[PDB]
Design a protein around this ligand. Structure first.
Ligand code: HEM
Ligand code: HEM
Ligand code: HEM
Ligand code: HEM
Lengths: 141, 146, 146, 141
């Protein structure tokens, strides 16, 4: 999946991030949770409020996937196959949030370095999710 | 839309912090990058050979004040959105017929332009009180569709 | 919603032609066939081993009068939908939190139940005046979401 | 694409239809066009109103695809590859209507034989479109 420069923009953004990826990943959660409109009744089970090392422990899971994904991006559908089993074969979560956590990274990294102002980067983390969103819900042929 | 003068005065006061004089043109030039497939309606801008041709277009600059302008009109009169959005919706419904699955995006893009140029103000209470506000426009331009 | 007593008296008079006494239960049993992935909310019905277990469920029969019932309430008072749908929306938003991408379906399914049991009445003017009508409910149960 | 009984329900419905498929295909058009809400400004270019042999000439194209599709359904993505080129590489039409013509068949055939009352047929013409909708917009790997 993916192959064109779409990655060069991702590896680039991942270059400035560096040892700061697991950090922006946590701020992406409090981004949509702060409004806690629907999930409020869902109760994710990890105190979306501060004083919850569980919230910051989840961000590292998102920034760790993009890395483990950039680590292959040519065979990640098998390594990230578990996530699809935990969100599809468990928790029955509603991917409808994918649209939130997707823009969150852009609104959360803004406080530091979001797109970068490149007529393509904005689409890199937004479209590169196409390979991360497809492996998160692989239809399994 | 429906917020208290306190939480609304913030998302509403950010208007000054926002240089609508052009920030409205960069909001669209970006919506294309994150979603360039909408090349069916922007077919009028003509100039679109490359993403850079969009920011170089003169209309996008003046057209940005129109898009971000219609929004400021609401904050200037939230007494009734469908009242003023009656033309935009009718003009965007029968004249442009923009699919209803797009506004929800222009709302997540602009916010990113603020958290970036003004991340020192993306306080939690300023964001939550930013969706339900413009969320009315997304439907306003769709209330005439159905 | 907004139709003339003439075009509204037809989609509104079809109520009698419709045996809401049960037609409301068959409308849901079908929404599952065309869209059975919604097994996350209907997880309460329990009985769901096979599509036939749905029509054999006793609640689906009484629960059908509730769904098709809320609709009849509007035609009985279109003066304000969000007014009565204030509980269903709040109960469906925080209590059930049903994604907004579903009502648009229950509206295309029920209509099929009428054109079938009453195709001799699916006249063109009776259909066009059938979407914008219930279309308000789809948003009503979503006005509290945003 | 597809393979399970999902077809047996389609071939079955196609059995009762028979030399009446090109007919229900035309009534599926006047189904959503009658409301002509948005397309009104689009002007399909074929008089959606009666007295237009073009409207009935289009229905046969839908019922002819399902047949030409059932004729293979194991290699139709190449035969129906043109439709995707005419709707994607031409007319720039907005597939957003797919949700209309999709239910139209169920509301139009109702005046005769829609689902058939089988806890699966309703999903046959509704889901079998998954193979007809994917070939209509193949992403072309
Ligand atoms: C492409 C976007 C996303 C990525 C890359 C991602 C990645 C991950 C990863 C790597 C984990 C760790 C799995 C483990 O514990 O082994 C995880 C866990 C989790 N994710 Fe996501 N996630 C994404 C979006 C979401 C969304 C939208 C939600 C719902 C708001 C969500 C909810 C969860 C939950 C509840 C867990 C914890 C599961 C557990 O207890 O093990 N994720 N995610
Ligand atoms: C949802 C936020 C949006 C707002 C508030 C908005 C507002 C406006 C306004 C006020 C105008 C000027 C109307 C006039 O010329 O009289 C306009 C024009 C236009 N908008 Fe939008 N717009 C929005 C989103 C979009 C989107 C998503 C597209 C498609 C990418 C779009 C495409 C256009 C086009 C093509 C025109 C020019 C039409 C013409 O030349 O008459 N707009 N918009
Ligand atoms: C959009 C048309 C719909 C209408 C008008 C409607 C209406 C209602 C009403 C009036 C109730 C009873 C509330 C009560 O018990 O006090 C109800 C309950 C329920 N509805 Fe719907 N509904 C609709 C669609 C759906 C859909 C699409 C689903 C998901 C397949 C759904 C799932 C449920 C569930 C699970 C309950 C039971 C909740 C409980 O036990 O309290 N409904 N609905
Ligand atoms: C799975 C559903 C659909 C199927 C199977 C289908 C099939 C076809 C077929 C077989 C043709 C004939 C192509 C030719 O002339 O060689 C055709 C033409 C056409 N279809 Fe569809 N169609 C579908 C949905 C739609 C929708 C939703 C629209 C938009 C309302 C649409 C608009 C058209 C138009 C405008 C043409 C004429 C193109 C021309 O002039 O050649 N179709 N379709």
């Amino acid at each position: 999946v993916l192959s064109p420069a779409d990655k060069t923009n991702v590896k680039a953004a991942w270059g400035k991030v560096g040892a700061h990826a697991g950090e922006y990943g946590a701020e992406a959660l409090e981004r949509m949770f702060l409004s806690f409109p629907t999930t409020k009744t869902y109760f994710p089970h990890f105190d979306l409020s501060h004083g919850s090392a569980q919230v910051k422990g989840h961000g590292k899971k998102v920034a760790d996937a993009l890395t483990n994904a950039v680590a292959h991006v040519d065979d990640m559908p098998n390594a990230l196959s578990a996530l699809s089993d935990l969100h599809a074969h468990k928790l029955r979560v509603d991917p409808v949030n994918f649209k939130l956590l997707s823009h969150c990274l852009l609104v959360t990294l803004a406080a530091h370095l979001p797109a970068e102002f490149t007529p393509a980067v904005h689409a890199s983390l937004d479209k590169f999710l196409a390979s991360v969103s497809t492996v998160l819900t692989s239809k399994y042929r | 839309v429906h917020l208290t003068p306190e939480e609304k005065s913030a998302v509403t006061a950010l208007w000054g912090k926002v240089n609508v004089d052009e920030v409205g043109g960069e909001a669209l030039g970006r919506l294309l990058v994150v979603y360039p497939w909408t090349q069916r309606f922007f077919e009028s801008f003509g100039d679109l050979s490359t993403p850079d041709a969009v920011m170089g277009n003169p209309k996008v600059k003046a057209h940005g004040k129109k898009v971000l302008g219609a929004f400021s009109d609401g904050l200037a009169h939230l007494d009734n959105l469908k009242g003023t959005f009656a033309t935009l919706s009718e003009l965007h419904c029968d004249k442009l017929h923009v699919d209803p699955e797009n506004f929800r995006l222009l709302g997540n893009v602009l916010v990113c332009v603020l958290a970036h140029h003004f991340g020192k103000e993306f306080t939690p209470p300023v964001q939550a009180a930013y969706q339900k506000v413009v969320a009315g426009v997304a439907n306003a331009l769709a209330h005439k569709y159905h």
